[PDB]
Amino acid sequence: AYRPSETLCGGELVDTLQFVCGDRGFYFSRPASRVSRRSPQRGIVEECCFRSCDLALLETYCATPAKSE
């Protein structure tokens, strides 16, 4: 069997973002911005919930890229 949802939308998306970044931090919006309002720009949800994504694509929404040399 496959997952009921191979996509990520809710708290499970946030969990994955914490996992792939570790302590590096991440943004839900494509731009990082400098004003953490309750209204972010569009971003991760478009590719991982409204579409399907991969961890490599997901990591591009991280504050810094992969550190796994």
From Swiss-Prot:
Spans annotated as C: 29-42
Effect caused by changing residue 38 to E: Does not affect integrin binding. Defective integrin binding and IGF2 signaling
Region called A, residue ranges: 43-63
Region annotation B: where it falls in the sequence: 1-28
Disulphides: 9-49, 21-62, 48-53
Superkingdom field: Eukaryota
Region entry D, spans: 64-69
Marked site: Important for interaction with integrin: 24, 34, 37-38
UniProt-recorded name of the protein: Insulin-like growth factor 2
Organism: Homo sapiens
Gene designation: IGF2
Covered range of the whole protein: 25 to 91 of 180
